[PDB]
Design a protein around this ligand. Sequence first.
Ligand SMILES: Cc1cc2nc3c(=O)[nH]c(=O)nc-3n(C[C@H](O)[C@H](O)[C@H](O)COP(=O)(O)OP(=O)(O)OC[C@H]3O[C@@H](n4cnc5c(N)ncnc54)[C@H](O)[C@@H]3O)c2cc1C
Ligand code: NA
Ligand code: NA
Length: 423
Amino acid sequence: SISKDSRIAIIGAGPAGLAAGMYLEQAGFHDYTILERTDHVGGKCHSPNYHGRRYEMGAIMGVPSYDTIQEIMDRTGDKVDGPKLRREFLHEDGEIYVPEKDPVRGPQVMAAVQKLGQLLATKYQGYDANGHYNKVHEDLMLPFDEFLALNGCEAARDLWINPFTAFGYGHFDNVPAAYVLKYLDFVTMMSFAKGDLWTWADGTQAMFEHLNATLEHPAERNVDITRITREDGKVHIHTTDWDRESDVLVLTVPLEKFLDYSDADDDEREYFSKIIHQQYMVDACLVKEYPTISGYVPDNMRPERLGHVMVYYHRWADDPHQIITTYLLRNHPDYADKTQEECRQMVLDDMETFGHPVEKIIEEQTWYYFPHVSSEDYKAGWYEKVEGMQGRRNTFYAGEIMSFGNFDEVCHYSKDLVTRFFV
Ligand SMILES: Cc1cc2nc3c(=O)[nH]c(=O)nc-3n(C[C@H](O)[C@H](O)[C@H](O)COP(=O)(O)OP(=O)(O)OC[C@H]3O[C@@H](n4cnc5c(N)ncnc54)[C@H](O)[C@@H]3O)c2cc1C
Ligand code: NA
Ligand code: NA
């Protein structure tokens, strides 16, 4: 419903921004500009170099159901060519164990997982749609454990938790079911269970670097946007080097932060102020005693264990002097934030306990991760409001908050945005 001569400003050159550009271009919208704050593209798909190979400070993997990412690879020529993923399970004291062989718990999990699968296919059909503009069943608005409890499927959490909480998405005691099941829909959960997982030799960042290259208008980098105002039916953007006018604004950046440099209206302030995010910290480590496999720590995914390492990534199996990244969470609604100080010490103390002591941390990042809203705010209609606001003063809303904090979900949402409002 937008004219092709519309000047479109895309904020953010992560997967969501780059995809917005790709799919606008492909629909015949050629006057777009992507504005990126940093000197690089890919956002949280971030793959730096060390000793001739790239490691992952962010996203690592996908599943075969990453249809939109497949479309992106078709465009760039990239292939799923990374090292195969495999894992073991550790207790908080470093003891290796196999949860699948628990005689009492094992059959409980498998019963719940099967019952849930059947409920998802029928009672909750539609749960798995990208975005939240299609209003989900009320049960899905509850925290994941409450959702499970209502259906007698509590034991399902043992399977679902490992690719969720450890991957920094937070805890089932509070994170609403709708987020969990849009990412870990039954097919995706199964793909994780089987280990049918994509990785990239040159990192997840590589294909978005290449996507950028294939664009008619690659991202403008190092753009320090100080002001956006939206009067007279136009979008005026002010940076450090220039101020310029566009017709349409497309946001793939943190929307609560956008409040601080925009003429945000009453609804934007009110609703974007409700956004909560995860403080997810990655440390890239040189280790003595190199693992021979990646490790998960369900024990350390309990809220009572916030700040502890929940998982570590074994990437290059052939070189014991390569990077092993560790993952912990710094926040939870029921607790005060953990300091970077105390969490870094837990990285040292946890890895030594696991038998993989750290010689060096060469890089650390706490990421702005998984923007979402509370079960109450979800129930109160958050996305009915925000999706209802779409196109208001030529501003459109996208990125992680409108879908989910994964790179297929955001790209798929960007694709559909063009379908929903532009064509
Ligand atoms: C440790 C880790 C593990 C992950 N694991 C997976 C996984 O297994 N599978 C998966 O699918 N995803 C995974 N992800 C999530 C995935 O990387 C993100 O969901 C994805 O990058 C989202 O893309 P986005 O563009 O929507 O936001 P982002 O990736 O955060 O990119 C946003 C962009 O906007 C820019 N920006 C922000 N503010 C401004 C400003 N005001 N002005 C201009 N530009 C701005 C940023 O610099 C950035 O480039 C992981 C991420 C991390 C950190
Ligand atoms: Na299992
Ligand atoms: Na999905």
